[PDB]
Design a protein around this ligand. Structure first.
Ligand SMILES: *[C@@H]1O[C@H](CO)[C@@H](O[C@@H]2O[C@H](CO)[C@@H](O[C@@H]3O[C@H](CO)[C@@H](O)[C@H](O[C@H]4O[C@H](CO)[C@@H](O)[C@H](O)[C@@H]4O)[C@@H]3O)[C@H](O)[C@H]2NC(C)=O)[C@H](O)[C@H]1NC(C)=O
Ligand SMILES: *[C@@H]1O[C@H](CO)[C@@H](O)[C@H](O)[C@H]1NC(C)=O
Lengths: 114, 292
């Protein structure tokens, strides 16, 4: 139960999109798409910056290259679904955006173990 | 980084993650010497101190307006714009191309040097446009009189901007060796692009439709017309040809007519005429139509 299969990708030269599915009853459910990232700067402290989209009942989010989310650096995304006062979070994805398309497979990408 | 206008700078960026951003310095235009703070319209709080702020610019969150302050008073501003270069191709996304895959469509009603150049955009927010002729047939365009109208293409809405231009040194009777070269600079929020175009007046010509279309029947119909007053003179040199039909030139059921006189039979419908430069395959005119 909860939000499931989160993916985000490029849909045009400037526009991007995140999509996800939700296992369970869909009535009176609201979703909040979260995005946090560390911007390349001159600060040595991490200084994580976060943005969010409230999409209500819909399970897609549209944005574009000038909305404030980096597309050439690693970003983290997850979905928080609300039913009543319970919030169900999705698993976190960590990816670039510029080289992802609607057909890019969500699994099978290399990850660095540190 | 190069300067576009006063305190407006363009930063060219490669649209790859591996490319480190362009390290650049922004100096505050002010006589003050101490306690200078820097802010950005995309970050919260002070982002640096001193009269000079050094930042690395890679993508759009690093662009925008940078402001220096002293004790709550703004000292100066500096706008950072990005010109995207992705896979070796300078960005062409602010504008939407026409049916023939061009971005700048120019039309001239005559050889006088007057012409109109138009373009299409879909996201009509935070836009700025500047056009200029870049050996050189220089033109001046009345940007101060830029206009736009809503047009629908492929069931999608766009705004068609248009600006009138005029060749500076003109000579209509003479033939053209070098073409006119225009460049439109397009800005959308923090994005910069430019589009180039070269052409001859001969090729962009689209005459006005004929005027005075009077008929005269026979036991057979004889309808005539005459040149539009916007067409170049003398008419003996700037001749026109006509295509007459009865309901890119879109001439499919018409026939070549060189003079204004024409005999025709019409059982029903509307006999329709257009115009075109006789000695060059330029654009044709909007059809003019009279009822049989
Ligand atoms: C369409 O866009 C392209 C790509 O953005 C653009 O090309 C760029 O034009 C600018 C404007 O001239 C170039 O900037 C110059 O680059 C040279 C080479 O290093 C410099 O010497 C120049 O320095 C002058 O300007 C400085 C401040 O701007 C001064 O401090 C200095 O004293 C000089 O006077 C200047 O930086 C830039 O190099 C190109 N980029 C490329 C990749 O070619 C093109 O001009 C645009 N076309 C139109 C018609 O707008
Ligand atoms: C996108 O680019 C990054 C940086 O090179 C790379 O690590 C990642 O695997 C790429 N993703 C895809 C889906 O190609």
């Amino acid at each position: 139960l909860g939000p499931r299969n989160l993916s985000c990708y490029r849909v045009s030269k400037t526009d991007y999109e995140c999509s996800w599915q939700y296992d369970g009853p869909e009535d009176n459910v609201s979703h909040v798409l979260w995005c946090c990232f560390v911007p390349p700067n001159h600060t040595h402290t991490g200084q994580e910056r976060c943005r969010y989209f409230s999409s209500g009942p819909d399970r897609t989010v549209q944005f574009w290259e000038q909305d404030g989310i980096p597309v050439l650096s690693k970003v983290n995304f997850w979905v928080e679904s609300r039913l009543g006062n319970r919030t169900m979070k999705s698993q976190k994805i960590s990816q670039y955006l510029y080289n992802w398309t609607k057909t890019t497979p969500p699994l099978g990408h290399i990850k660095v173990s540190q | 980084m190069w300067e576009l206008e006063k305190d407006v700078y363009v930063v060219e960026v490669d649209w790859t993650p591996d490319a480190p951003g362009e390290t650049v310095n922004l100096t505050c235009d002010t006589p003050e010497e101490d306690d200078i703070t820097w802010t950005s319209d995309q970050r919260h709080g002070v982002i640096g101190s001193g009269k000079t702020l050094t930042i690395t610019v890679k993508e759009f969150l690093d662009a925008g307006q940078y402001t220096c302050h002293k004790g709550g008073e703004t000292l100066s501003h500096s706008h950072l714009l990005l010109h995207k270069k992705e896979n070796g191709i300078w960005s062409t996304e602010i504008l939407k191309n026409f049916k023939n895959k061009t971005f700048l469509k120019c039309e001239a009603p005559n050889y006088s040097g007057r012409f109109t150049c138009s373009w299409l955009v879909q996201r009509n927010m935070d836009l700025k446009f500047n056009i200029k002729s870049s050996d050189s047939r220089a033109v001046t365009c009345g940007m101060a009189s830029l206009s736009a109208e809503k047009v629908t293409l492929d069931q999608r809405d766009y705004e068609k901007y248009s600006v009138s231009c005029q060749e500076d040194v003109t000579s209509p009777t003479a033939e053209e060796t070098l073409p006119i070269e225009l460049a439109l600079e397009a800005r959308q929020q923090n994005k910069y692009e430019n589009y180039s175009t070269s052409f001859f007046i001969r090729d962009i010509i689209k005459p006005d439709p004929p005027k005075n279309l009077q008929m005269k029947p026979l036991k057979q119909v004889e309808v005539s017309w005459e040149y539009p007053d916007s067409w170049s003179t003398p008419h003996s040199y700037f001749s026109l040809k006509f295509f007459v039909r009865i309901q890119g030139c879109n001439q499919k059921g018409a026939f070549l007519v060189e003079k204004t006189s024409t005999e025709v039979q019409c059982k029903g419908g509307n006999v329709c005429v257009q115009a075109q430069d006789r000695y060059y395959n330029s654009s044709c005119s909007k059809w003019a139509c009279v009822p049989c």
